[PDB]
Structures are given as C-alpha cells and as structure tokens.
Specification:
This is Apolipoprotein E. Belongs to the apolipoprotein A1/A4/E family. There is one protein chain. It contains 5 helices and no strands. It has one domain. It starts with a helix and ends with a helix. It is elongated and about 65 Å long. Helix 1 packs antiparallel against helix 3 and helix 3 runs antiparallel to helix 4. With 143 residues, it is an all-alpha fold.
Amino acid sequence: GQRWELALGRFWDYLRWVQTLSEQVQEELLSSQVTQELRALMDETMKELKAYKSELEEQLTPVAEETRARLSKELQAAQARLGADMEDVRGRLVQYRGEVQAMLGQSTEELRVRLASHLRKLRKRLLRDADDLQKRLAVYQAG
C-alpha cells in the first residue's frame, strides 16, 4: 500500500501482539516500552498521512469550488479521528500500567480481562475510521 498505510500496518502488527497480553507483553507494558513504541508508530502514521494528502493535491481533477474545500475539510477531520483513535489506544495502556503499579504483588488477571475487552473495542473504532479515511482519500483526486 501507500506509505501511511504501511505505517498504520506496523501499528496494527504491534497492537495485535500487545492484545495477546503474554508475559513478554506485560514486561514491555510495565516498563512503558509499549506506549513509547505506539507513540512512535502513531506519529509516523500521521506524518505520512499529512505528506500523502499534500502530494495528492498535485493531481486533482478540477472540481467545483465548494466541492474541493468541503472534501478537504472532510479529509482533515478523518485524519484527526485516526490520530485521536491511536492516542486513545496508547492512553488506555498508560492507565493499565498505573493500575498494575498501584497493586503490590496481587493478581492482574481481572485487569487484563477488562483491558482486553476495551482494546477490542478501541481497535474496532480505529479500524472503521481507517477504512473511512482510505475511502475518502481514494475519491479525493476525482472529487
């Protein structure tokens, strides 16, 4: 795919691993390596998305006036939603790290069940927003 799509793919591959919540994952969650890596992957995705939009604007089918401006604002909101979704994933993992750090040596199993259910829902949101964003970019040129 496009560069931003590959960047998002690396975010997906890393989050899929995190969602396994193995002991290897736990180690990287509690050390904050997971949230630092997700931040890096998110920032690269957004950077590539912004640059891709800028390059698409070099080959536009001249459409009307109002249509171009409206479509560019719709695309900017779709990008913003993608970024906020990725930040919501990272923030939920930050919350989990703080909860584990408060609970001495006690069992995290219930925390992990709850985290997994919530991550499944955050992924569903990120994924529908990404598919929507791809569709808007795909029609953006011809307008």
